[PDB]
């Protein structure tokens, strides 16, 4: 059988902040910013640093 | 409160193939190839396409 290996890396596209009353509201704002820009992706949220990442 | 959003992308750094009796052998082979090339990362496997990915 033939098997394939893809080697992949991660790259930084961008960084932004926003003011929101809570993390849930910030997530909806950021999902809009990232997804009206058409790119559904993988989300993380770290509450200690109030930071979301999206990998799209 | 201030929230941050880091936007990430994916990069294709390489691709190889190998011939093997089964997926478990292919994985060992590919891990050797990765380790020889100082590629360290997270592994996935998609049986439908017989493709491993390693993301660094
Ligand atoms: S390069 C990362 C990657 C590999 C594959 C499984 C083909 N993918 O769908 C993505 C883009 C996640
Ligand atoms: S944006 C790609 C990326 C994700 C994370 C794991 C947060 N990183 O440290 C980098 C900047 C490599
Ligand atoms: S030999 C391929 C392999 C590597 C490691 C991650 C140590 N494994 O558990 C297997 C045997 C799948």
Curated annotation (Swiss-Prot), chains A, B:
Q: What subcellular locations does the record give?
A: Secreted, Cell wall
* Gene responsible for this protein: spg
Recorded protein name is Immunoglobulin G-binding protein G
Q: Where are the sequence repeats?
A: 3-56
Q: Which span of the entire protein is present here?
A: 304 to 357 of 593
């Amino acid at each position: 059988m033939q098997y394939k290996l893809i080697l992949c890396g991660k790259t930084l596209k961008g960084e932004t902040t926003t003011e929101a009353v809570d993390a849930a509201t910030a997530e909806c704002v950021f999902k809009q910013y990232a997804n009206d820009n058409g790119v559904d992706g993988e989300w993380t949220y770290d509450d200690a640093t109030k930071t979301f990442t999206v990998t799209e």
